[PDB]
């Protein structure tokens, strides 16, 4: 019933896969409002879209940029799979086009702003609340992993909170289809699982560790692993030495110990029942796993919003010129975007 | 404390991805 839903969740994301959409607007079709987030190669933009009315964030990726990193394959990643997905906690991507100098990608608005705000604002969530969140992981990663992708970047800053205080999961930069193992290091550096900086090949298991971060961070307000620099963080990954709050439950306590499992042979979501060891853990005996999935859980906490075009989720950001060559640029390198 | 420390460090904002 899971494996006949995923079956045919399959088959739609395969056709999409193989004949991925391309060209469905161009820059002057929308109107560009404020800047809700910042990025390594652009940033992204609340916008209008003139003919509708709505509004839509616009990633916008400077092609030069992104050469100059060697993100090329990455980024091609990220587009060919955002277009193809489709789950309830994955943020839809509403159009895609490029020009002479950037690439764009519209997706739908997501009004709440990033968990980051909100946790490091409220300090730590319950654990009721973080495992309302966590949940739709679970499910969501369960989803991805069954379509052979890995996801490589969880953390609470690409994790959207929308008008119905659920998750919309964004940036799949690192988002990568793959059957055995991968090599690249990449990720953030308090998320990374053991086997990435060791640089040893790694699976899917890499998400399932982050998500023990990620539920370990929510409920406590602080990563298990941190420090001033990357590579002292990395020391502490590998030793995987975990301390916990005294206020974290016993079953909690558990399941982190689970997730952040240095050895791969025992680590859960990589055993023999996969998921199913996670969401059979009593930390989750009180989650309805359907309910998450059609979204009919009430949900912790939801974001105040005033009317559609409301940023006041999210941080200001200083505005520059969108600037567009007379001549292009990369052309062949993204030739399939 | 631990949150003290977490709060006194210099990662307690938006964290960069690395692709090394
Ligand atoms: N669909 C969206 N709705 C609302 N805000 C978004 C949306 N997508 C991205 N953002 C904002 O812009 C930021 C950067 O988006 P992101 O995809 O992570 O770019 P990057 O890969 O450069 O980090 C996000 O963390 C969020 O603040
Ligand atoms: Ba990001
Ligand atoms: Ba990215």
Known sequence: ?337 | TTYADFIASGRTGRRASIHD
């Open chain 1, 1 to 337: 019933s899971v494996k006949e839903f995923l079956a045919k969740a399959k088959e739609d994301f395969l056709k999409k896969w193989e004949t991925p959409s391309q060209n469905t607007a161009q820059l002057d079709q929308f109107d560009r409002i404020k800047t809700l987030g910042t990025g390594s190669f652009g940033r992204v933009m609340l916008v209008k879209h003139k003919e509708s009315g709505n509004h839509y964030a616009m990633k916008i990726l400077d092609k030069q940029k992104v050469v100059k990193l060697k993100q090329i394959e990455h980024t091609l990643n990220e587009k060919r799979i955002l277009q193809a997905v489709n789950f309830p906690f994955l943020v839809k991507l509403e159009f895609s086009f490029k020009d002479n100098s950037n690439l764009y990608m519209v997706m739908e608005y997501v009004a709440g702003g990033e968990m980051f705000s909100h946790l490091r604002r409220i300090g730590r969530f319950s654990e009721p609340h973080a495992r309302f969140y966590a949940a739709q992981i679970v499910l969501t990663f369960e989803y991805l992993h069954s379509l052979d992708l890995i996801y490589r970047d969880l953390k609470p800053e690409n994790l959207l909170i929308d008008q119905q205080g659920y998750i919309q999961v964004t940036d799949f930069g690192f988002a990568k289809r793959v059957k055995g193992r991968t090599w690249t290091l990449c990720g953030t550096p308090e998320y990374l699982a053991p086997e990435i900086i060791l640089s040893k090949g790694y699976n899917k298991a890499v998400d399932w560790w982050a998500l023990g971060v990620l539920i370990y961070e929510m409920a406590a307000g602080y990563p298990p692993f941190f420090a001033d620099q990357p590579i002292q963080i990395y020391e502490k990954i590998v030793s995987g030495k975990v301390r916990f709050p005294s206020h974290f439950s016993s079953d909690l306590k558990d399941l982190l110990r689970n997730l952040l499992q240095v050895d791969l042979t025992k680590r859960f979501g990589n055993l023999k029942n996969g998921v199913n060891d996670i969401k059979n853990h009593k930390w989750f005996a009180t989650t309805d796993w359907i309910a998450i999935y059609q979204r009919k859980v009430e949900a912790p906490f939801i974001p105040k919003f005033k009317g559609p075009g409301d940023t006041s989720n999210f941080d200001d950001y200083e505005e520059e010129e969108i600037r567009v060559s007379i001549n292009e640029k990369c052309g062949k390198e993204f030739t399939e975007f």
